[PDB]
Sequence to fold (1840 residues):
Amino acid sequence: AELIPELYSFQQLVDSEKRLDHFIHLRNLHMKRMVAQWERSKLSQEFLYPHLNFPNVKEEPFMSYSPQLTAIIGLKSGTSHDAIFSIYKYIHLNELLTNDQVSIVKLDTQLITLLPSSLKESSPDTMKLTDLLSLINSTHLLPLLKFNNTQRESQIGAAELNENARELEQIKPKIALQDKEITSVLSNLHESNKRYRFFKKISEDPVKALNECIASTSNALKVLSGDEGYNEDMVRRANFYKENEAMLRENIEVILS
Amino acid sequence: ELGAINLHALSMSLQSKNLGEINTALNTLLVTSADSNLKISLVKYPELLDSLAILGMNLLSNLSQNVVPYHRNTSDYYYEDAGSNQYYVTQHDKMVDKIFEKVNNNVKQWDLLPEPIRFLPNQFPLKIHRTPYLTSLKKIKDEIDDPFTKINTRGAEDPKVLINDQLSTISMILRNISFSDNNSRIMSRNFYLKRFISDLLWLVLIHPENFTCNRKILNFKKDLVIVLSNISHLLEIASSIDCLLILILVISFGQPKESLTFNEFQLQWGKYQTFGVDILAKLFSLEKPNLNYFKSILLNKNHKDKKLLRRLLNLYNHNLLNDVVSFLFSAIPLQQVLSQSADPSLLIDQFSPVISQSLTSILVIVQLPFVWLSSEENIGSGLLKLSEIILNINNSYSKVLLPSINISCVQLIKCLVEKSICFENCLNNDPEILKKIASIPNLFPTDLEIFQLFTNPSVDIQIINQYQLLYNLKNDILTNLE
Amino acid sequence: PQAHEIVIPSYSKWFNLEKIHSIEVQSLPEFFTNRIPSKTPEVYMRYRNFMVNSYRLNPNEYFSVTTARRNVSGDAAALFRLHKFLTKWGLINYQVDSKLLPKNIEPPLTSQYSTRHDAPRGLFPFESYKPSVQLPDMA
Amino acid sequence: EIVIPSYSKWFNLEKIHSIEVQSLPEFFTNRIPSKTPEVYMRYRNFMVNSYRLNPNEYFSVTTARRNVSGDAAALFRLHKFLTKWGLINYQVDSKLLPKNIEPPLTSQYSTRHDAPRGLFPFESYKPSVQLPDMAKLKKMMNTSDSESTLYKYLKESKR
Amino acid sequence: VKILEQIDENWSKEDLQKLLKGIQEFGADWYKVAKNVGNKSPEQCILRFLQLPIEDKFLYSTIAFLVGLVNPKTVQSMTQRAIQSAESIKSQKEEISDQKPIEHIKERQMNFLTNELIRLQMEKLDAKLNHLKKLEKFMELERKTLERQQENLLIQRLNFNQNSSKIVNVLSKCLNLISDIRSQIDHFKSMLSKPET
Amino acid sequence: IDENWSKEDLQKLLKGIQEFGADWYKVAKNVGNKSPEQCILRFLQLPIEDKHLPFSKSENPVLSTIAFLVGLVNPKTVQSMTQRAIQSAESIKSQKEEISDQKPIEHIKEGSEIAISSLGYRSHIFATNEERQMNFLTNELIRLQMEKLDAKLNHLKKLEKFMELERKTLERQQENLLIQRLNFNQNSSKIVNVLSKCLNLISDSSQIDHFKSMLSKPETL
Amino acid sequence: NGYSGYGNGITNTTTRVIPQVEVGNRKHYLEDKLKVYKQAMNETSEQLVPIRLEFDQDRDRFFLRDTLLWNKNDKLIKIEDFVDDMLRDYRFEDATREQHIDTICQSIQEQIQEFQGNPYIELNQDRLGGDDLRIRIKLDIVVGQNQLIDQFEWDISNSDNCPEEFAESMCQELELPGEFVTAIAHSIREQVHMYHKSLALLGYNFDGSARSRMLPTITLDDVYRPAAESKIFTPNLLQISAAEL
Amino acid sequence: SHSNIDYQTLLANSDHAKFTIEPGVLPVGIDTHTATDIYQTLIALNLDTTVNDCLDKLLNDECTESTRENALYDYYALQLLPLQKAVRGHVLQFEWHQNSLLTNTHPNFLSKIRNINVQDALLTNQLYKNHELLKLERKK
Fold:
């Protein structure tokens, strides 16, 4: 877990450059968040690209509108999408909507004049704008080189995003190898640390260190095998003059025994 | 294993001798571990919990007092006699004895059951143990084999480790008991259990050294936060100290390194950092004018208790709850938004919403001298992209999705407006803030997205309003900027 | 005179018909603040030993608090308190019922004590080679 | 005429000791008319002389209730008092109260789960010590295993 | 040699005398032996009997502090078997001599090419940090610029579409007044013709 | 007690151990038929196996050498040809006074032995731990090299990718800008034309302010 | 191994869980005492309460003719719980509706709700050994097969004297074993109470003589020890008889 | 040239991770089992010697009936020693058993909640809603 990427907690921090390579790793995490959000940023910037159809200034898609339409938006041609978003915002601003479905909008001659032949005049409604979208997508959009331009649009950023992803993946496995090396050298550091601790402790006062390491080795021998509570106390005097729980435990025993 | 039938072992546990305590505690622990068919019902149980908390309190106490129990030279430790009495003496005639006494030569208070909890003289608050999950490797380094392991992996050749492992086992079995109905039995009414929790906390964090293996400390923290997870009701008697304790406990996790202090956790190691926010929601939902209010006082920057409280805040050095914010900001992002699909999300998604809930709740509690802002090239907010993810999911577990996205949007708007109005009221910063606010790629869903949204799903009315008012504030900021 | 075999749940093996123990006071303190003179450790012990004797007499069959209340009293409340207390601690009304078993046998049995690996105190299963004899031993 | 507890050898069958009034003040509030040092004198003197009549046999208090119809409260109290000073009932070993019981002494114990009654160790043995038998093997003999042999080894190899 | 067991207090000589006499030919019947002694509790006998030395057998080390286990023996472990004779002061003066020899043979624990390397590492660290943060803030400010300008363009388009629609509604009102782009000029010409009439 | 040597023996001993130092085989070779240990314990003023001690139980033996052996091993290991310790050799009077002082049965000898033991340890300890810290810093420098590699590759990624993205975005932005500019230009022009027209019409019955003003003005009637 | 946790028990079974198998029958109560008891009865204690219980009358079928005491200063026991414990101790049919306990606790609290302990005679007044007015207490009891009657002075004005001493003293009869003495003191505390209780209805709890029925119901000065046939009411008698109650 | 015998130099280096040894250092003093077992034996040896000694002493009746009784109790205690050792071990293992509290093992403790389930989240929301609704009502 946490062990795998690092172990740096405290090592006496001799020649404490560990803070510095720490900071290095920190800034690596910084760059990681950076690149992540950058990929997301490029995604987002793309998002609009497939959905826009404004570029006209540098087959031909700008279909002309109806007299009603040029009365509505004052614009003569283009795509239906632009017109429908426009009338969408129109409904928004005039607020002819209703919110009990919501697409029911209070009709107005500014609008109903778009379909007056079906005697919609018989009923100015509060009806689904979707019904109008269905109405005005061919009912008033009609008619009455630069092929290269179709290239220079959304596809661009998509392709370059793919290139960037590809080269990032290209560099990834080298990073993986470096991480393996990191783990290795870390474990080696760790062992060497243990050794140094041991050795300096020996430097302190070898008598006590020797006694303790010896006893610990013996104890390890034993625990790695069957275990016994007391190696000693055949020297009865000590553990019995200097101990009395023997009395109580005994008492408990004899009752059953 | 097997055998091991009765429940009434409590009696022996209630008894004050090492022997019985071992005999029961170990057994009953093994018991509550088994679950294949083994559960601890509730009929006239409670006595069990009482006994348990009493034992733990006393042991931890005289441990803090650094004195071994179970073995002295006193015994049957009060009066023993067969004096001049049949059944009714110590009336007037008793003074005759005085007379008798004056011629032959020729009231109390009683303490309560448990000991006090805090104000203990030896235990005086000095900052130690505010260290993160990192200590695991410390643990490793501790548990590492070495000529001086001092891990008496065997029994108590000295009583210190005995008390240690005793308390450890108690904690563990307490955890295991806490996984069912009968949480109500544990529900904040075992005043004993709560005293235990409190003083145990007050030790584990303000811990003058008597604990042997740091791993024991980890175990304590761990099963403690777990058993907390299985509480969903009141806490915080003598609150303030306990509230700060719990906050530090949850803050235990997550990697530290103004700005956010917490590297978001790479979610493939831990599962406790979960439990943390889980509790900080559940055991914090109670808007009763206590808990929320305790943390509200924790906004600030017998009676001696109050001295303690500030005593720790400056002993945690401005503000601090920003750290809580940063902590809350972990485990959500940067992995699911960096995956290859949105389906593996749903799992930790189930976990996610309580976090945002906690957050927006605490933002009801911030409406005075501060400097706070938490969108500074620290998180951005993929919350928008996340919302888009769950949206696309909607039109393509369950029961949590819509509320999650809704509250995400609400969070966005509320934190935005609160930041703005706060640094307006202080007015210690240039209007650049607006420009600063206006400079986020992770912000303000594009109006084209609004439009296309306004059409297809038609099943998100409330969410539509959310985005609507969001965009409204956006456009407002744009306008009034100039 | 003694005519019965009286057993107790061992953990209780701290009680002594002669003396008192910190246990019970922490469970029945109302006789020890020395505030109510009509109560005292002494009358407590009197009641205590009286009731335990009563039970131990014919323990095969139950004994009630109401019984003692009829017999002796200085209070109903405290009487009941301590009676039910001792009940809990099984010092009284513990052998009200009897239960038996044929107890078939298994490879382990109480009369089985042989030579085998030992967890207890030291033991040496290998004594000495030949050249050990080569020492000017103690005489 | 009859010996009493030595320390008690001070009574005044004709007077009131300050020890009395100090012990029992109720007869001296000078408020209760029904009570007076006089009637208490009569009380005590009657009581003690009556016991003096056949002190070879005990004398109870209920008698006094029968015999003076004073307040049995003070009667019982003073009776206890005089017995406490042995002034009464110094020749008897009887008149005790029953419980139809006596404190028994037999007991048994059993609370088996696994730990007490032994934690069930492995079996063992070795009640009695044993003999090395090597003493003869160690005994100086010209048929020594190696003792004489190693002696000769030293003496033939040290050159 | 000459092991004396008349060595106990609070129990008379004859106390333990009768004690051991019983346990000799009575085989640990603690009840019997308690009966067989002068008013001591059976458990008392057990305890006292349990604290009876055999002070002539335990001799005062490597084995004297370890049993049923031991250090291996093919290397120089006998150093253990010679564990101590002057431990404290010996090791103290030994540390004295050790530091002394250190200082003597001596005439920081690194060399100077080392110090060169160290300074170079430090400088590279600083330079990398600076490059990092500079490029970071640079990207960030570029992003902010682009964003601000983007939303600017957005609201610009919004306001101007609004203005278009606005004047459209205005001219619609005007057309209504006439009661008594293509459609724009159309209605304009219609109004002009009406004015001619 | 005394030991088998001569004047010139120990003379050349001292001379050579000053000449060579810490290489006991070498100086030993400077006096034939002499064990290095002989030459070692003689400087330590020590005989061979004439006395365990904390354990009367000793290893069985009839002719061997155990304690002094490891003693000399540790001693020679010390290499402190100028070991400051219990009295050393500069003139035979040093040994004279040592014997004059050496009067304990063995205890003094034992203290001296364990002292030299500890000494050799301490020396090896210092040297070893020095090498340890050396290895430590080596490993850390390696870590630094790894971090450098990481950072460098990331830098390349940053430069290339992000310069590309920002360039393309800037281009898109400026396109959008100028196109909407001219759009609104066409709009405003059209609006002004309409303004002229409606102005004429009303007269025969920004400036949008005055337009609507005259509009409501005529709308009165 | 062995089997013991609850009455020679069973510890060798199909390895299940069993909560507190202790009942003689519905007999396990220790739950919920610790905190409340400590915090409550660490403070002063005060008067007690005699109580009589009659339910055998031809309105309900019982053997309820027992007495007992009580501390009105107590709030530690759900009285009904105590009642049910008593009833199960009386081995009655477990159906405690036909063995209605509500009626019983009703009678109980009813009786308790007419008490003040001793009056200001204890609450604020303190007369050394009381003042006067030793009531000619008349007590008869019917135990086992024998009845016993007595009459004797016993002060109402004094607090310094408790009943139970008289009980253990008159125990010095044949055996007066156990069961007797209790009721005596009970009756005692019964007998006395009503009087000053009735006197509490008036107002002499401080002053001397009262107002009309207290006149015949008194002892006098008694300047001299009495005759043999008057006090010949004080003595006591033990008589066998066929019961007709 | 050679002398049938090899030697060691003083200028080589160390991998610092070797696995080779050589009996050119004389760490002779391999004394683990030998000394241990001879000590053990010697114990009982000298013991039995003392046994025979006190036995013969008390047997020689020419010795005082003030020395004898000593030796008699001595033989008693000695012949009894293994018994006390045994029961000692009994009670010792018994008390030692108390210091065992499953430090030996480290079982899982039912860390069930891998995630907090749906019930947890919806419970949080439900509690919030109910609490706020009661709040709204408190003045109604």
About this structure: The radius of gyration of chain F is 50 Å. Chain F touches chain H at residues 23, 25, 52, 55-60, 64-67, 69-70, 72-73, 131, 135 (CB under 8 Å).
